[PDB]
Design a protein around this ligand. Sequence first.
Ligand code: HEM
Ligand SMILES: COc1ccc(C(=O)O)cc1
Length: 393
Amino acid sequence: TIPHLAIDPFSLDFFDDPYPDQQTLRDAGPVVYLDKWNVYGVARYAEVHAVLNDPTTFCSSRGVGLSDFKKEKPWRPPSLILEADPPAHTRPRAVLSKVLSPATMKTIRDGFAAAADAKVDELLQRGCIDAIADLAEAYPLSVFPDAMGLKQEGREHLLPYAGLVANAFGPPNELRQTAIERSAPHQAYVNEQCQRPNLAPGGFGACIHAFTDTGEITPDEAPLLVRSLLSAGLDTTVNGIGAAVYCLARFPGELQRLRSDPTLARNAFEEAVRFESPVQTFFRTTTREVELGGAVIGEGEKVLMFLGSANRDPRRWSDPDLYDITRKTSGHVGFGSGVHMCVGQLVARLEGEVMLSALARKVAAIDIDGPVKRRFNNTLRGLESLPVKLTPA
Ligand code: HEM
Ligand SMILES: COc1ccc(C(=O)O)cc1
């Protein structure tokens, strides 16, 4: 009843061009079995959305990577939010929600926007840049570590640690084992910066520690919650901004619409998140026998959700393979859906919005003028290098 496929969604060939294989996965049926890794897969929007929104049946506390924490030891102490289920999830989630809240965004927006404008001004003086290193990486690194309250020294560990975390959700392939082999210095830096004395007053990390006296989290839970923001708070924003620049370079008609109405900047970034989905996949583990899309899945089975595929499912989206900055993006699953839906989404959207706004107001053309190189990661999609020429408006 369930089609079995040999597609390896964690292979370099798949990463290099995933979209034909994602169509094969969608069109094979609502639920597939991936023989390479002995997991179930769902690649259509309907089933991905259903799985995300049933956390009791499709839990997170046995890990959201391939590994089942009931069977194997986690490679680091589990996240108190990403790898927890309700009710344990609920109060740590509330703390991070308040730390990264709508009200917090007001306190950081002016500085984030000023830094985005300053970066584009700097880049226009150079003309020919690498939109990854010099823009997609450089801009988040110029605002988010400061907003965290991190010291200056050791920040070179942040992107490597995030890539390690992302690779470690994958299967035990070469990408994962090489990441773990190289992990020790990055883990040591990150774990140390999570301690309260190392986080500057008023920043995200200090605010997490300040919540330890409300009864929502204890003092010994705050370092792991800081760790969540150091794990998740940079690499997907980098990939999303790079994806947005890539899209504006490949679809010049959309850059022209953005220039003509810069208030489209927020939705142009949201559409980039749908179109390139920086987080491609997450797993759940079944806690009982369950019927999903006409399939019976036993207890204790891993279920791989294809978020990027769900965001390009023609059953849900009109012309899913077009980048359209006025698309109604509401409902895409690039940030997840339901109780675990990205708690940092307002930070990511703020950064993406103000960077695309600066581009919309200052740049007349973005032309690729060198070889584009892909960055390979078991769970993240994004570019390694994006040589562009920026023409000033
Ligand atoms: C474009 C940028 C981003 C993308 C595409 C993205 C994607 C996602 C997705 C798909 C999830 C759902 C995980 C699941 O259902 O198992 C998630 C959760 C989460 N994200 Fe983001 N994320 C981004 C930016 C950020 C930022 C900037 C932060 C922190 C400042 C952050 C922190 C978190 C945390 C802590 C969780 C776990 C939430 C929970 O389990 O309740 N993310 N993200
Ligand atoms: C979206 O990716 C991540 C990665 C790590 C964590 C965490 O460490 O809590 C959360 C989300």
